[PDB]
């Protein structure tokens, strides 16, 4: 079916009634299905809205107001599943469609909306606003949200025509034949769960149904509650991971589908994203990237803050911007990636009258620590006071050099009272040379080796004026002794450069945990990598070799095929939508019950499911 | 030759001191660079008058705070250098150095200029 | 403001090694710099960063700054070497910068 988003303006005009109108009919041109919010307003009279008959099913909320237009042609309007509200509670809202004239919407021919999942509907101020004051509104709004209604009809004073005979208790939406109101909920019988067809309990509706049913399967609902799988209504699209007993382990449905509004889709439409809880979605939302998968894209969440690059200094707004002061330091909230220069100069601290700036705060300097990439230089010769070192640049890795100070450097830290530099992270300079003097009371500076951060021949670097070797190491401010002869940033294990043996995650250790220690580990790469939970501890032995349950040396619990489990399959979904149980042995085995025994089992054959 | 001085060399009292700087081959709208005006009178020692950014933050020299202005034209490329009220202590030789960021020594000196203030 | 205290004049004999000092309060949390003036000329830049050497001037300098004294240490002295010799040093927090009164060093 044919799908538009939908608007969220409420009550606000995109600039005149025409322009108004336009931006209305490019949205829900040939649209069927509204993910969104459905919003006519200020649609005026004599205005075709003939495109609003192909509308069937809204997520959202339907509002209608301002609208001076005698007839909005929502014939096929179906369901309103009400997933957002208006004002508080309201999925159908109705408001002040009139003018000076008096004379505005009319004709509201909904002969279809025979539902509305969630939410109130509100009709307030709408003379000559005809047949709706007659529609029974408890056979279509839900049951919970009758007690939230605002039904407001002062239309005594227009000329309306009478509903049809026909109709039940005389509830038309309109004047015609095709407007009597279709009872399909509250006339039920008891026994009809849900809806019906018609009063008898030979004709009832499948709970799983929406607006009716043309018959008594599942496959015969008008419109689906919930989600709707090729031609069928469904609780839930079928799953995407399933455990099959061949591989003993989650792998991908084949005939597991992705869910897309009210729909299960094999493959999300064009340009259309899915998220890692299996849904659809136009692109994906903050606190998320995009990544590519099997050649469809997918959402993956961002690793800590997401990429944001940011002009620096000499760039756009900041050029010929002295330092990072007080005054713009608003614009680097969230920025990871500084496309130019930095400057860290004394006149942000203290500020000057030229510029018309105050004095930098100190405690604002927090604000780059998600700074990750330098495009340009690094310029610091100022620092605050109480600070050991540049703690707001413990996340910074890369410092490109494209543009480089004094036509040489593009790391200048020079004339600063902290005790280590802090830098952690930085991995790589790929051009531009180091400057770090006249730094008094800095260690740990003649320690790195830059030749490993270089990545351009001829790089220099120039630390001199600082505090001397022979005052740091008397005081202890060395490299630790876990640090590799590369240097280090500071004299916890954290600061190294490299490790001299292995690395359990950011800090350098001795020796990894394979035969002692509380979480066991395995060696890859120099770094020590924790065992799978369920690998249970050896005294003579190794844990384990690898990352999943299929390295253990010895399960801990229970062994499901070449895996550790904390508990056999008990209940977990299978293919041909047949629950999939096991039962544990005598060694702890994980082997399947009976085919018939639907409700699990302890032991084999039909023994363990009795009657 | 880089960094060339002009100006009157006679100055009458109590009336404002005009110099400026022309900077050649470069660019004064460099982010590496401060612009500096230093003074000594004939016999002393330096004298560190202020120093001028191309965006036009300026430093001055507390004894000189009051009657000094220092300015900057990125068009032109050159900053010039305004003493108002000069006395007889003010006769010195004007000079205009560079002063980089990485080290806030003077790399490059001006040859400088006289100006001498009388009656 | 700050204030720098240099030795008025210091004679040295030919080939010998001359030292002349900058007092300062706290001198050494600071970065001196040395400026050789030769009469009639423009200060040049012998010396930055306490110690460091500019390309162009020859491996004779050495500086040496610590505790309230600087020191610019001229290795072998020549005749040529005869100028007026200023330290300066700029405030980190005042951005101001700071000459020394200056000093005629004489050869013997």
């Known amino acids: 079916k044919k799908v538009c988003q939908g608007t969220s303006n409420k009550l606000t005009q995109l600039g005149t009634f025409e322009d108004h109108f336009l931006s209305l009919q490019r949205m829900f041109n040939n649209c069927e299905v509204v993910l969104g919010n459905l919003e006519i307003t200020y649609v005026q009279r004599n205005y075709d809205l003939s495109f609003l008959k192909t509308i069937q099913e809204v997520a959202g909320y339907v509002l209608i107001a301002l609208n001076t237009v005698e007839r909005i042609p929502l014939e096929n309007l179906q369901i309103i599943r009400g997933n957002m509200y208006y004002e508080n509670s309201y999925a159908l809202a109705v408001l002040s469609n009139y003018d000076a004239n008096k004379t505005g919407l009319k004709e509201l021919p909904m002969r279809n909306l025979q539902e509305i999942l969630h939410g109130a509907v509100r009709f307030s101020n709408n003379p000559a606003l005809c047949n709706v004051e007659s529609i029974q509104w408890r056979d279509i709004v839900s049951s919970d949200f009758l007690s939230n209604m605002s039904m407001d009809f002062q239309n005594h004073l227009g000329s309306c025509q009478k509903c049809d005979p026909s109709c039940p208790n005389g509830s038309c939406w309109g004047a015609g034949e095709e407007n009597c109101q279709k009872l399909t909920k509250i006339i039920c019988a008891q026994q009809c769960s849900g809806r019906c067809r018609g009063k008898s309990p030979s004709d009832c509706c499948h709970n799983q149904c929406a607006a009716g049913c043309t018959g008594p399967r599942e496959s015969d609902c008008l419109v689906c509650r919930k989600f709707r799988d090729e031609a069928t209504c469904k609780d839930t699209c079928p799953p995407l991971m399933l455990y099959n007993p061949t591989t003993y382990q989650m792998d991908v449905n084949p005939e597991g589908k992705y869910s897309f509004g009210a729909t299960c889709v094999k493959k999300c439409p064009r340009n259309y994203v899915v998220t890692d809880h299996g849904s659809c979605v136009r692109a994906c939302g903050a606190d998320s990237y995009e990544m590519e998968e099997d050649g469809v894209r997918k959402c993956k969440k961002c690793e800590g803050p997401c990429r944001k690059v940011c002009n620096g200094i000499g760039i756009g707004e900041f050029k010929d911007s002295l330092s990072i002061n007080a005054t713009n330091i608003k614009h680097f909230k969230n920025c990871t990636s500084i496309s130019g220069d930095l400057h860290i100069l004394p006149v942000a601290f203290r500020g000057d009258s030229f510029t018309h700036t105050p004095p930098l705060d100190p405690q604002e300097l927090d604000i780059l620590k998600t700074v990750k990439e330098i495009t340009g230089f690094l310029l610091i010769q100022a620092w605050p006071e109480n600070r050991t070192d540049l703690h707001a640049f413990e996340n910074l890795e890369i410092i490109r050099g494209r543009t480089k100070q004094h036509g040489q450097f593009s790391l200048a830290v020079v004339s600063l009272n902290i005790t280590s530099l802090g830098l952690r992270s930085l991995k790589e300079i790929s051009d531009g040379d180091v400057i770090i003097s006249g730094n008094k009371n800095l260690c740990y500076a003649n320690t790195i080796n830059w030749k490993k951060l270089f990545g351009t021949s001829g790089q220099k670097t120039k630390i001199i004026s600082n505090r001397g070797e022979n005052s740091c190491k008397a005081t202890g401010q060395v490299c630790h002794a876990l640090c590799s002869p590369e240097g280090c940033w500071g004299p916890e294990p954290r600061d190294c450069v490299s490790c001299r043996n292995v690395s359990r995650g950011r800090e350098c250790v001795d020796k990894c945990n394979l035969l002692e220690g509380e979480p066991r580990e395995f060696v890859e790469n120099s770094e020590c990598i924790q065992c799978h939970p369920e690998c249970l501890p050896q005294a003579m032995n190794i844990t384990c070799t690898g990352r999943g349950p299929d390295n253990c040396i010895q399960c801990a619990h229970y062994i499901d095929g070449p895996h550790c489990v904390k508990t056999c399959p008990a209940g977990v979904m299978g293919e041909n939508n047949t629950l999939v149980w096991k039962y544990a042995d005598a060694g702890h085995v994980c082997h399947l019950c009976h085919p018939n025994c639907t409700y699990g089992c302890t032991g084999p054959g039909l023994e363990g499911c009795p009657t | 030759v880089q960094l060339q001085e002009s100006g009157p060399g006679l100055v009458k009292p109590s009336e404002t001191l005009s110099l400026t700087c022309t900077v050649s081959?470069?660019?004064?709208?460099?982010?590496?660079?401060?612009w500096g005006w230093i003074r000594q009178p004939p016999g002393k020692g330096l004298e560190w008058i202020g120093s001028?950014?191309?965006?036009?933050?300026?430093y001055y020299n507390p004894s000189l705070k009051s009657r000094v202005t220092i300015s900057v034209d990125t068009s032109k490329n050159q900053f010039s250098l305004k003493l108002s009220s000069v006395t007889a202590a003010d006769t010195a030789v004007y000079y205009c150095?560079?002063?980089?960021?990485?080290?806030?020594?003077?790399?490059?000196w001006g040859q400088g200029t006289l100006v001498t203030v009388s009656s | 403001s700050y204030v720098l205290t240099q030795p008025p004049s210091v004679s040295v004999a030919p080939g010998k090694t001359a030292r002349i000092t900058c007092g300062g309060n706290?001198?050494?949390?600071?970065?001196v710099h040395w400026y050789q003036q030769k009469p009639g000329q423009a200060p040049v830049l012998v010396i930055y960063?306490?110690?460091d050497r500019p390309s162009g001037i020859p491996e004779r300098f050495s500086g040496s700054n610590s505790g309230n004294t600087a020191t610019l240490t001229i290795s072998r002295v020549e005749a040529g070497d005869e100028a007026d010799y200023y330290c300066?040093?700029?405030?980190?927090?005042?951005?101001?910068?700071?000459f020394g009164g200056g000093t005629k060093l004489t050869v013997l």
């Open positions: 300066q040093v700029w405030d980190s927090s005042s951005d101001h910068v700071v």
């Open positions: 706290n001198i050494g949390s600071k970065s």
């Open positions: 150095a560079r002063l980089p960021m990485v080290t806030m020594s003077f790399d490059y």
């Open positions: 001028i950014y191309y965006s036009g933050s300026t």
């Open positions: 081959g470069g660019s004064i709208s460099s982010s590496s660079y401060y």
């Open positions: 960063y306490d110690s």
